[PDB]
Amino acid sequence: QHLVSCLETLQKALKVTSLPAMTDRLESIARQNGLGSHLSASGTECYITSDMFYVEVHHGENPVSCPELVQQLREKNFDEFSKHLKGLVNLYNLPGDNKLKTKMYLALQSLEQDLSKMAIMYWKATNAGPLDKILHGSVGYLTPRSGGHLMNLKYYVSPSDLLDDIILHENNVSRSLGMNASVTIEGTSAVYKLPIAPLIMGSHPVDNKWTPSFNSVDLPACFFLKFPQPIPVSRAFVQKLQNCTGIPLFETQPTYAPLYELITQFELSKDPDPIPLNHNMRFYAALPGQQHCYFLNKDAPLPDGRSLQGTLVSKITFQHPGRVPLILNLIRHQVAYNTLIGSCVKRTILKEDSPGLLQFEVCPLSESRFSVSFQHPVNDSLVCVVMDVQDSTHVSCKLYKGLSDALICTDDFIAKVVQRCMSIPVTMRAIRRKAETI
Amino acid sequence: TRERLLSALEDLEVLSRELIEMLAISRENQVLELLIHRDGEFQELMKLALNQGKIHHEMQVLEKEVEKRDSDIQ
Amino acid sequence: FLPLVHNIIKCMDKDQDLNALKSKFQEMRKLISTMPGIHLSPEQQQQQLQSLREQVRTKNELLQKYKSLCMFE
Amino acid sequence: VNLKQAILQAWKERWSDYQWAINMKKFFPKGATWDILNLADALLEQAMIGPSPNPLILSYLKYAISSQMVSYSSVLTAISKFDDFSRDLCVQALLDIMDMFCDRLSCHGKAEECIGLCRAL
């Protein structure tokens, strides 16, 4: 009986005819997502579950006539409307009970208002362009929740990916054109105290001031900062991040292997192909001038004697937004280091390459530092460029050479070329070219 | 082509009837996929079916004209 | 055709026998839609048109040739 | 050709230490005990350029000490010529390398090698 009901949504989804049958297609969408449909007149039909009730013509007014939803329905995109309902259902997958669910949603609304105000304060203090806000701003470019989609804070926009095939952001910045993190309430086994009303009642003109808790209630949930694709993070970052918040980042200690392997998986899996690369940590890179091979050297001992080890993090839980500025600054740092080392990872088949193969390599000297070692471009001794990722957007590099050697490069010229475009497989090219030009 | 259209029509009717009857007995993605595939076949050749008839009427007119011309020539 | 089939499925979801009989009559109408003057493909339709055009042109040309041919000075 | 070119012809294509030993033998027919050619000097230069040493060329030097390719005297001189001292990681690597041979500190050769070991100590 229930399978025949699910059976009819499927054949009603392939049904496509006039407006009457398109209202029956909206009824199909309801039972497809296991929703309940009540229709008053031909014009208004309402899908109702919990507080997730919306009408195409609980505890809150109908918020907005979203153009997004209206445009999709007016045009022939019932599939897009189906995705939007799925997003709404996932947001309210909240367990809780009833009165607790309404309060828990209220807490999310307070957090959203506070985060929005904090973003506004940064714009008032400095009229920064969207790119500056995303790369180095309090919170991040923030899009308020629309329908199912929850608030997205853009932590970082990599220089290579800002450029597509020299994009100027404008206020039209795409939702996925960068690295994005979503803020949401999710149920937890433990019990926590969360603000149930806006906590930025009084705001100090520079930065923000939060009125102290209790209002608040001990709901069995915490605010979350879910990342759509899990970000590989190192053990050192877990300690640096914990120092501020205090909430255990990984709680039940799971697995923790070399970080460089996880960085390769994240980069390789961005574009999926059937054949596994089988890199053996010897990625080959082809560039406009010269050919390079990079050995990532995981398992190199750090000063402690343990190889850099880290575990993918998808959800970070924060009670209030006070520790959020500090947590984001550490993340920004972990993400930037991953991007520079990530740019090298590539799925190429450089086999039997006699010319060039100007191989470069990478050893983990310490958490937050790595050394790329290469033969001197003009002379013969090994030379290297470190890149400690001090901050998300800032890397400091020192090119030590032997006592008798040819001045390979000026640290500023390399920086100018990298900031113009970017990528670190790219940084090694600039070091080689500058040395050769001299 | 006529044969293909007739076969598609028969398949569609039987399978749609079977799916509806199973829904009725309870209170079928294989059937659904088959339906949409032959529905595309019928619809794409239904624009053709309509025009074919108009073209056939035009052809009949042309034939009449040719016949007259020949008979006149003879 | 497909709309009528979907309407029959909707009637089954609502439930009738009369509607199924109507679907059978629609299938008879379909057999009429297979042959209300249907008999040819898109290619054949193109060849027949070209042949008819060529025939009209040749007949008109022959008639004009004898139109000019004036037996009386 | 040069030792610097071989040591990274060894670092480039990832060579394990014994394959480095074989190919280092093959690149140079005269062994010259490897201390005339200053193996320890070239390995320390192209290992201690970065803030942290690359573990490949340190693995090469630790094999070239544990296997008796390189005398302890040339290693102790090449350790002595490093200083810089702003980097603790390179200094800790040098102290682990000294922790390898120290105490044994044994020369089985000519007496000039023993005098060289004395000056190197």
> What single string gives the DSSP state of each residue in A177-228?
SSEEEEEEEEE-SS---EESS-S-SS--SSS---PPP--EE--SEEEEEE-S
User: How do beta strands A141-143 and A194-195 pair?
Assistant: unpaired
Sheet containing A369-375, strands listed edge to edge, beginning at the edge strand earlier in sequence: A282-286, A291-295, A360-366, A369-375, A382-386
Q: Please give the helix or strand (H or E) that residue A62 lies within, else none.
A: none
Chains B, D in contact, 3 or more Cβ pairs below 8 Å:
no
Length of chain C: 73
**Residue of A293, A330, A290, A327 whose CA lies nearest to A430:** A290
Contacts of A280 in chain D (CB under 8 A): 14
Amino acid at residue number D8: L
Q: Which two tokens stand for residue D5?
A: 């070119």
Give the burial class of D44: count Cβ atoms within 10 A of its Cβ; 0-12 exposed, 13-18 middle, 19 or more buried.
buried
Q: What angle do CA A386, D6, D81 make, to 5 degrees?
A: 60
Sign of CA dihedral C52, C53, C58, C64: positive
Phi then psi dihedrals of residue A9, to 5 deg:
-55, -40
Q: Does C6 touch chain A (CB under 8 A)?
A: yes
Q: What angle do CA A217, A221, A225 make, to 5 degrees?
A: 120
Q: Which two tokens stand for residue C40?
A: 């040819």
Cα–Cα dist A111/A139, whole Å: 12
Cα–Cα dist A414/A433, whole Å: 10
**CA-based nearest distance C27→chain B, Å:** 7
Q: Which two tokens stand for residue A151?
A: 């608030």
Residue C52, CA atoms < 13 Å, CB-side half-sphere:
18
Sign of CA dihedral A270, A272, A278, A283: negative
Which residues on neighbouring strands pair with residue A222, listed in sequence order?
A: A186
Cα–Cα dist B65/D92, whole Å: 106
Identify whether the C-beta of residue A260 lies closer than 8 Å to the C-beta of residue A268.
Answer: no
Cα–Cα dist D64/D20, whole Å: 10
Alpha-helical segments (H) within chain B: 2-26, 29-73
Cα–Cα dist C58/C61, whole Å: 5
Coil/strand/helix, residue A338: helix
Phi then psi dihedrals of residue A306, to 5 deg:
-115, 135
Cα–Cα dist C20/C27, whole Å: 11
Phi then psi dihedrals of residue A358, to 5 deg:
-80, 75
Q: Please give the helix or strand (H or E) that residue C53 lies within, else none.
A: helix C42-68
What's the resolution in A? 5.0
Q: How many CB atoms lie within 10 A of CB A127?
A: 8
Q: Which two tokens stand for residue C70?
A: 């004036």
Q: What is the DSSP letter of A433?
A: H
D56·A363 Cβ contact <8 A: yes
* Radius of gyration (C-alpha) of chain A in whole angstroms: 26
Q: What is the DSSP letter of D87?
A: -
Q: Which two tokens stand for residue D32?
A: 């010259």
Cα–Cα dist C2/A91, whole Å: 37
Cα–Cα dist A129/A131, whole Å: 6
Q: Which two tokens stand for residue A53?
A: 């009730």
Identify whether the C-beta of residue D40 lies closer than 8 Å to the C-beta of residue D120.
Answer: no
Q: What residues contact residue A420 under an 8 Å CB cut-off, 6+ apart?
A: none
User: Distance from CA of residue C41 to its chain's centroid?
Assistant: 10
Q: Does A301 touch chain D (CB under 8 A)?
A: yes
Give the burial class of A183: count Cβ atoms within 10 A of its Cβ; 0-12 exposed, 13-18 middle, 19 or more buried.
buried
Q: How many CB atoms lie within 10 A of CB A291?
A: 16
Q: Which two tokens stand for residue C23?
A: 């679907």
Amino acid at residue number D28: F
Of chain A residues 6-25, which have a CB less than 8 A from chain C?
8, 11-12, 15, 17, 21, 24
Residue A362, CA atoms < 13 Å, CB-side half-sphere:
31
Q: Which two tokens stand for residue A378?
A: 């003009």
Q: Which two tokens stand for residue A157?
A: 């926009």
Q: What is the DSSP letter of D32?
A: G
Identify whether the C-beta of residue C23 lies closer than 8 Å to the C-beta of residue B13.
Answer: yes
Q: Please give the helix or strand (H or E) that residue C50 lies within, else none.
A: helix C42-68
Residue whose entry in the numeric block shows the structure tokens 């249907």: C38
**Residue of D120, D109, D116 whose CA lies nearest to D78:** D120
**Residue of A36, A198, A182 whose CA lies nearest to A110:** A198
B28·A5 Cβ contact <8 A: no
> How was this entry determined?
cryo-EM
Q: Which two tokens stand for residue A26?
A: 């909206």
Which residues on neighbouring strands pair with residue A217, listed in sequence order?
A: A194
Cα–Cα dist C18/C23, whole Å: 9
Identify whether the C-beta of residue A175 lies closer than 8 Å to the C-beta of residue A89.
Answer: no
Identify whether the C-beta of residue D48 lies closer than 8 Å to the C-beta of residue D56.
Answer: no
User: How do beta strands A291-295 and A360-366 pair?
Assistant: parallel
Q: What beta strand segments (E) does A296-438 contain?
A: 309-313, 360-366, 369-375, 382-386
Exposure string of A220-258, with b = 16+ CB inside 10 Å and e = fewer, is ebbbbbebeeebbbbbbbbebbeebbebebeeeeeeeeb
Cα–Cα dist A132/A393, whole Å: 11
Chains D, C in contact, 3 or more Cβ pairs below 8 Å:
no
Cα–Cα dist D116/D121, whole Å: 8
Q: What residues contact residue B11 under an 8 Å CB cut-off, 6+ apart?
A: B34, B38
Interface test with chain A among B18, B32, B37, by most A beta carbons within 10 Å: B32
Amino acid at residue number D38: N
Whole-number Cα distances in Å, B68 to A230, C24, D20: 81, 44, 99
Cα–Cα dist A224/A243, whole Å: 18
Identify whether the C-beta of residue A144 lies closer than 8 Å to the C-beta of residue A112.
Answer: yes
Q: What residues contact residue A270 under an 8 Å CB cut-off, 6+ apart?
A: none
Coil/strand/helix, residue A143: strand
Whole-number Cα distances in Å, A269 to A176, A231, A324, A345, A349: 17, 12, 29, 10, 17
Q: Which chains touch B (3 or more CB pairs under 8 A)?
A: A, C
C6·A8 Cβ contact <8 A: no
Q: Which two tokens stand for residue A17?
A: 């005819």
**Residue of A383, A429, A361 whose CA lies nearest to D11:** A361
Cα–Cα dist D6/A333, whole Å: 37
Cα–Cα dist B5/A199, whole Å: 69
Alpha-helical segments (H) within chain D: 3-11, 17-27, 39-45, 55-66, 72-80, 88-101, 111-120
Q: How many CB atoms lie within 10 A of CB B3?
A: 8
Q: What is the DSSP letter of A149?
A: B
Sheet containing A309-313, strands listed edge to edge, beginning at the edge strand earlier in sequence: A231-234, A309-313, A257-258
* Chain B residue at shortest CA distance from C15: B24
**Residue of A405, A410, A409, A407 whose CA lies nearest to A379:** A405
A361·D54 Cβ contact <8 A: yes
* Chain A residue at shortest CA distance from D59: A300
